[PDB]
Amino acid sequence: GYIPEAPRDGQAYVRKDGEWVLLSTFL
Amino acid sequence: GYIPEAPRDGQAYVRKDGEWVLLSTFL
Amino acid sequence: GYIPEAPRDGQAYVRKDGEWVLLSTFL
């Protein structure tokens, strides 16, 4: 399926396990 | 909503504030 | 067109040239 927009909250997101996850978690 | 394709310019993108932003911005 | 779901495999993905690619390459 196609995935919905990531949160629009000033943060960058990456895709993991069917969810948008904060890039900062990996940095 | 659903999300348009990122640029097909050979660069990696993350999703931020309803836009595709270069991953390199944050590395 | 629209973005499809990434693999659901415990790894983080970013978008490049119409595909999902591993974030870990870049870190």
> Could you tell me if A26 lies within 8 Å of chain B, comparing CB atoms?
no
CATH number at residue C1: 1.20.5.320
DSSP-derived pairing of the beta strands C19-22 and C13-16: antiparallel
C-alpha dist (Å) from residue A11 to A6, B19, C17: 10, 11, 22
- The Cα B16–Cα B14 span in angstroms is 7
> Could you tell me if C10 lies within 8 Å of chain B, comparing CB atoms?
no
Picking from A2, A16, A24, A27 by the largest number of C CB atoms within 10 A of its own CB, the best residue to mutate is: A16
C2 DSSP 8-state letter: B
Which are the contacts of B10, defined by CB distance < 8 A and separation ≥ 6?
A: C16, C17
At position C26, the amino acid (one-letter code) is F
> Could you tell me if C20 lies within 8 Å of chain A, comparing CB atoms?
yes
Alpha carbon dihedral A20, A24, A26, B5, in 10-degree steps, equals 40
The angle formed by the CA atoms of residues C1, A26 and B13, to the nearest 5 degrees, is 25
Q: How many domains does chain C have?
A: 1
User: By the 8 A CB rule, do B20 and B12 touch?
Assistant: no
Query: In terms of residue numbers, what domain contains C3?
Result: 1-27
Q: In Å, what resolution does this model reach?
A: 1.2
User: By the 8 A CB rule, do B23 and B13 touch?
Assistant: yes
